[PDB]
Amino acid sequence: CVNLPPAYTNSFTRGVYYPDKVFRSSVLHSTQDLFLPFFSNVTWFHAIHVTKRFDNPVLPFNDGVYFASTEKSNIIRGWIFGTTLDSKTQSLLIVNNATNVVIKVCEFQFCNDPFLGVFRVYSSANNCTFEYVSQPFFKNLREFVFKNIDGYFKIYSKHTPIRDLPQGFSALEPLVDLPIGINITRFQTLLALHSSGWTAGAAAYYVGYLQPRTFLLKYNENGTITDAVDC
Amino acid sequence: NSNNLDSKVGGNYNYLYRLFRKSNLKPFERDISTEIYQAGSTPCNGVEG
Amino acid sequence: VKNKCVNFNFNGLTGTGVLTESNKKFLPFQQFGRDIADTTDAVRDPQTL
């Protein structure tokens, strides 16, 4: 436990995330759901040391979040989710300790400056009600989507090999769904640096928020979303 | 019914329920917090009276 | 029984029709076809896949 004016962008057409698990081909399907509207103000954060930047504040988790990151050296690891991020409430955590994917829900006591080394994230763990630990787990984009509805915490993900947001179209496929059962209001990203010594970092991640909308989605002859319209 | 397993001959006090919450829960959402609940407007500092 | 009018029960979904091979390719999280009118027109056998 050691201590250490943002920019805006457009987010042209991103965050579509197939709504159901039903195959459809050569149709036009209209569906209402929590989407990221088109042409929205999207915050921007940096990690480049030209300038000694390690900006990673606490943002609010209004009604779901879209996340993106254009990196090269695997500097962003995971996230935290809670309401008051101390041992008085239950909190979630996702992280990759250089070989794993660790998910758990506890009553952590988090440091005001969590990070890892390229383990200083939390100082306690008391009431584990869930655990999902697993086996030893600017070119790419790595889009994500996080939601929390009816006790279930849903995640959608997508990768795209490729300093702005590339304006293409790519639909996100469902990845997992967790029965955590907690009240989530805020979150915070986790980074790994290389105290008064740290450098050689460039992450450049982006964030966005969702709201209820009605979309018109297009399926091709193979069952792939290739377009969308905001009504 | 389980009146022969969960009941003892002098009182079983190992089953609990939450009284005195500030707002009603949501579907399938859990809460295991134990923080002194304040009825009036006077502040509380972890003491019960 | 392919190419014959049969009543079927696929994982709890009943109905009656003719079963034929398809060129469609699903994704590992899909099991039904759901044509424009919300009717099934494709299914994945839970044994031969």
- Every domain of chain A and the residues it spans: 7-231
Give the amino acid at B23: S
CA distance B21 to chain A (A): 14
Answer yes or no: do A127 and B32 touch at CB < 8 A.
yes
> Which residue type is seen at A76?
I
Q: Do A151 and B33 touch (CB under 8 A)?
A: no
- Rounded to whole angstroms, the Cα distance separating A60 from A54 reads 19
Please check whether residue A138 is in contact with residue A70, taking contact to mean a CB–CB distance below 8 angstroms.
yes
Contact between chains at A27 and C31 (C-beta distance less than 8 A): no
How many degrees, rounded to 5, is the angle at CA A172 between CA A166 and CA A174?
Answer: 160
The greatest distance separating any two alpha carbons of chain A, rounded to the nearest whole angstrom, comes to: 58
Identify the H or E element spanning A158: strand A152-158
State both tokens at C40. Answer: 């099934």
Q: What are residue A193's phi and psi, to 5 degrees? A: -105, 175
Dig out the tokens for A195 from the structure.
Answer: 């105290």
* Contact in structure between B32 and A90 (CB atoms under 8 Å): yes
Question: What pairs with residue C13 in β-bridges?
Answer: C10
- ∠ CA A177-A183-A189 to the nearest 5 degrees? 70
SS3 call for A179: strand
Residues of A with Cβ-Cβ distance to B29 under 8 angstroms? 151, 181-183
Which among C42, B33, C19, C46 is positioned nearest to A22, based on CA atoms?
C42
**Closest of A69, A64, A66, A65 to residue A46, by C-alpha:** A69
How far apart, in whole angstroms, are the C-alpha atoms of residue A27 and residue A91? 42
**What is the 3-state composition of chain C as percent helix, strand, coil, each rounded to the nearest 5?**
0, 30, 70
Question: Cβ–Cβ contacts within 10 Å for residue A112, how many?
Answer: 10
User: What residues in B contact A127, CB-CB < 8 Å?
Assistant: 32
* Cβ separation A223–C27 shorter than 8 A: yes
Contact A203, A73 (CB under 8 A): no
Which of B33, B4, C10, B41 lies closest to A82, judged by CA? Answer: B33
Q: Is C40 near chain A, with CB under 8 Å? A: no
Strands A59-60 and A152-158: unpaired
Residues of B with CB under 8 A from a CB of A: 26-33, 35
Backbone angles phi, psi at C44, to 5 degrees: -105, 120
Superfamily of domain A7-231: Spike glycoprotein, N-terminal domain (2.60.120.960)
A80 contacts A110 by C-beta, under 8 angstroms: yes
Block residue for tokens 């980074």? A191
Of B28, B30, B35, the CB nearest to A150: B28
Residues A91, A58, A166, A228, CA torsion sign = positive
In whole angstroms, give the CA distance from residue B10 to residue A224: 66
User: Which residues of A sit within 8 Å Cβ distance of B?
Assistant: 88-90, 127, 129, 150-152, 179, 181-183
With an 8 Å Cβ cutoff, are A23 and C29 in contact?
A: no
* Cβ burial A143-164 (10 Å sphere, 16+ → b, else e): bbbbbbeeeebbbbbbeeeeee
- Experimentally, how was this structure solved? cryo-EM
A225: CB partners within 8 A, 6+ apart: A16, A18, A169, A171, A217, A218, A219
Give the separation between CA A231 and CA B11, rounded to whole angstroms: 62
C-alpha angle with apex A144: A138 to A158, nearest 5 degrees? 70
